Amino acid sequence: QSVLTQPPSASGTPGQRVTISCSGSGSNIGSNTINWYQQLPGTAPKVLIYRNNERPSGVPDRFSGSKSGTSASLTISGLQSEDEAYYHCAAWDDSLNGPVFGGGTKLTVLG
Amino acid sequence: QSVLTQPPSASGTPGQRVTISCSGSGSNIGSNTINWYQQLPGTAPKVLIYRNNERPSGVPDRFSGSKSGTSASLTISGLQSEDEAYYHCAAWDDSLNGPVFGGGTKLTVLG
Amino acid sequence: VQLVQSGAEVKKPGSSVKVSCKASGDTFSSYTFSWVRQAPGQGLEWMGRSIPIVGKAIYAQEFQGRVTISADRSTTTVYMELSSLRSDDTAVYYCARDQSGFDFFYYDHWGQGTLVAV
Amino acid sequence: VQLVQSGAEVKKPGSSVKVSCKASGDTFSSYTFSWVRQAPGQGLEWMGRSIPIVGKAIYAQEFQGRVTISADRSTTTVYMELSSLRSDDTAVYYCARDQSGFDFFYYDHWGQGTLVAV
Numbered sequence: 001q002s003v004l005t006q007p008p009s010a011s012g013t014p015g016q017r018v019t020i021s022c023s024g025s026g027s028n029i030g031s032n033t034i035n036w037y038q039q040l041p042g043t044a045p046k047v048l049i050y051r052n053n054e055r056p057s058g059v060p061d062r063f064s065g066s067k068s069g070t071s072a073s074l075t076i077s078g079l080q081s082e083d084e085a086y087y088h089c090a091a092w093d094d095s096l097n098g099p100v101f102g103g104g105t106k107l108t109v110l111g
Numbered sequence: 112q113s114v115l116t117q118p119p120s121a122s123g124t125p126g127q128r129v130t131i132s133c134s135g136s137g138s139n140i141g142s143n144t145i146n147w148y149q150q151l152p153g154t155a156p157k158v159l160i161y162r163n164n165e166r167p168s169g170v171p172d173r174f175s176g177s178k179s180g181t182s183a184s185l186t187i188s189g190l191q192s193e194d195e196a197y198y199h200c201a202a203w204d205d206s207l208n209g210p211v212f213g214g215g216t217k218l219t220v221l222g
Numbered sequence: 223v224q225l226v227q228s229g230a231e232v233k234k235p236g237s238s239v240k241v242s243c244k245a246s247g248d249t250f251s252s253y254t255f256s257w258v259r260q261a262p263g264q265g266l267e268w269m270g271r272s273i274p275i276v277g278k279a280i281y282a283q284e285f286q287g288r289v290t291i292s293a294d295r296s297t298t299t300v301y302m303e304l305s306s307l308r309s310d311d312t313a314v315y316y317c318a319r320d321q322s323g324f325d326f327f328y329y330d331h332w333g334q335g336t337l338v339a340v
Numbered sequence: 341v342q343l344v345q346s347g348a349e350v351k352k353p354g355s356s357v358k359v360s361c362k363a364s365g366d367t368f369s370s371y372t373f374s375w376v377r378q379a380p381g382q383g384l385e386w387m388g389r390s391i392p393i394v395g396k397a398i399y400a401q402e403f404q405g406r407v408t409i410s411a412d413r414s415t416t417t418v419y420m421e422l423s424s425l426r427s428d429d430t431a432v433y434y435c436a437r438d439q440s441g442f443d444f445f446y447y448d449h450w451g452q453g454t455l456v457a458v
Contacts, residue, residue, distance in 0.1 A: 002265045035329070037266070044332040045266070045316065056330065068136040069181060088266050090329065096283040099329075101258075103265035112382040119381070148384070148447075155343070155434065155450045156384075199383045201447075207401050210446070212376075215383030 003028070004089040004102035013110040017077035022089035022102045026070055029091055034072040036065050037088040045088070049074060076107075084108050114139070115200050115213035122219035123190045128173075131216045133183040133200030139211055143203040145183035147176055149196045156199070160185065187218065194218045223248055223319050225255065225333035232339045235311075239304040243317040243333040250274060250298035253325045255317040257289075257302050260335065262314065269315075272300070273326055311340040341366055341437055343451035350457040353427065359420040359454050361435035368392055368416035371443045373435035375409060375420050376450070385431070390418055391444060429458045 004024045012018040022034065033052050039045035047056045049065035052072070062078035072089060089102035116134050123129040133145060144163050150156035158167055160176040163183075173189035183200055200213035227243040243255055256271035272279035272291045279291040292301040302315060315336040321328035344362030351357075361373040374389035388399045392411035399407050406423030418435055433454045436447040 002267075004265075006265065037329075044334060045260075047330060066136075068138070069141065086263070090266070098280070098283050099256075099268045101266040101268060104263075106263070112379060113385065115383075117383065146446075150450075155452060158448050161446070197383070201384065209398070209401065210376075210386040212384035212386065215378075215381070 002103035003093070003096075003100040004034075004091070006087075006089060006102040006105045008103065009106050009108075011108050011110055012079050012083075014079045014081070016079055017075055018079070018107065019073045019075045020087055020105045020107070021071060021073045022105075023071045024089070024091065024100065025093070025095070027095050028093035028100055029067070029070045029072065031094070032091045034065070034067055035090040036072075036074050037090060039086040039088070040082065041084065041086070045086075048087070079109065081109055113214045114204065114207075114211045115202065117198070117200055117213040117216045119214070120217035120219060122221055124221050125190050125192065127190050128186055128188040129190055129194070129218060131185045131187065131198050131200075131218075133185075133213050135181055135202075137181050138206045139202045139204035140178065140181045140183060142205055145176065145178045146201045147174075147183075147185045148199045148201060150199075151193070151196045156197075159198075190218075190220065192220050195220050223253075223331050225317050225319065225331065227315065227317060227333035227336045230337045230339075233307055235307045235309060235340050237307050239307065239311075239338055240301065241304075241315050241336045241338070242299050242301045243315075243336075245298035245300075248298075250295055254320045255300045255333070256320060256327075256329065257300075258316045258318055258329070258332070260314040260316050261312075262337075264313075266316070269302070271320075271327070307340045309340060311338060313338065341449050343437075343449060345435065345451040346454050348455040348457075351425070353425045353429075353458050355425055357420070357422040357425065357429075357456065359433050359435070361418040361420070361451060363416040363418075363437075366437070368411075369413050371437050372411065373418040373451070374438050374447060375418075375433060375435050376447065377431035377433050379428070379431055387422075387433075388420070389438065389444065392418075425458050427458060429456065431456060 004022045006022045036049040037045050038048040052067045064075045066073050086104045088104050093100045147160040148156050149159045163176045163178045176185045198216045204211040224246050225243050228241050233239050257269040259267040270281045274293045274295050290303045317333040318329045319331040321330040342364035346360045372390050375387045377385045388409050390397045390409045397409045408421045410419045434450040436450040439446045439448045
């Protein structure tokens with residue numbers, strides 16, 4: 001249902017680097033930056049990468065994100081125990097004149 | 112190590128058409144034109160294609176360039192014995208605000 | 223910035239839901255909460271964005287009405303009312319402070335959330 | 341464009357870099373010589389551009405202020421010096437007349453080049 005196409009689930013062992021890709025349209029991704037949100041299960045969502053080039057409140061610099069065309073990819077190098085979280089893409093859309101959101105991807109910690 | 116990625120070495124029979132690829136993002140490939148330089152082994156590099164469409168008069172028609180979104184392809188065509196050279200894809204990069212170049216492909220002339 | 227939302231609400235389908243999140247230790251006039259729908263284990267979904275001054279607001283592109291805004295500056299509280307409830311409405315309301323720039327746009331923080339079952 | 345360049349130099353790491361690029365058969369006041377190095381197997385690598393008039397210059401974002409590019413109109417030369425000297429520096433340094441339009445924009449004719457081994 002989400003305009004931004006995120007994978008529904010993902011896995012990763014501690015220590016490795018994994019990418020999550022969300023794709024949208026040119027009016028909302030090609031014409032606007034994407035914002036990556038993280039949300040620990042049972043808790044309020046936070047902001048992980050914003051403006052694709054900075055972190056809002058000194059968030060671990062090991063986290064990264066990239067934007068190209070109508071696609072965006074969050075790359076994190078430093079998997080750790082409480083990295084299990086739902087990750088979302090958000091961007092303003094002129095056609096809908098509103099913040100369109102992704103479907104959310106769960107990053108888990110493997111044993 | 113270069114931002115733009117090219118195959119390490121592409122070979123072909125004499126007379127055959129050989130394609131050299133250059134992959135990247137829209138910041139330098141989508142937003143700025145791709146150009147292809149060639150340097151013969153032991154010689155200073157000479158311009159092959161600039162702005163993807165025009166050539167400096169001497170270049171035969173076999174050398175052509177195409178740019179699609181964030182990808183570029185140079186079809187050398189009409190392979191001859193002197194084709195053997197290092198091929199570099201170049202473009203302006205707005206993120207770096209300067210010229211960036213590919214990894215270089217070694218054309219080989221087969222028997 | 224701490225946002226305090228209401229608790230778990232269970233409502234019959236086709237009924238009305240009243241949910242409010244409070245502003246604490248901040249300038250409610252210069253802060254706005256843009257409500258966001260959140261299905262559990264599912265992607266977020268914007269509902270609306272309002273401003274305490276004048277009371278102007280914008281709602282979801284999909285829904286012309288459905289949800290009505292209200293804001294009280296004296297109590298520093300934002301109220302959201304949902305009508306024509308459906309089984310798809312079983313999800314959470316997260317509010318959201320609005321980053322910076324007199325706090326009228328973008329998302330920075332969220333209230334504990336309000337789970338609703340329909 | 342004869343394109344005169346200095347010879348190959350191997351002064352070892354922690355020493356110095358000397359790259360003079362002499363203009364010949366043309367007007368140097370309107371023709372500059374921007375510098376590009378080739379890392380083995382990594383293709384062309386941009387390091388900087390010079391302006392013979394006024395004296396302005398632009399260096400690579402990766403490179404620090406240590407790289408120093410200047411121009412001499414009287415002798416029609418471009419002088420490049422790199423303070424840094426490491427194993428990664430080993431490369432062939434080529435300077436090219438920058439096309440046309442008063443010749444500060446984009447490479448056309450590279451010179452013989454200077455292989456530096458570190």
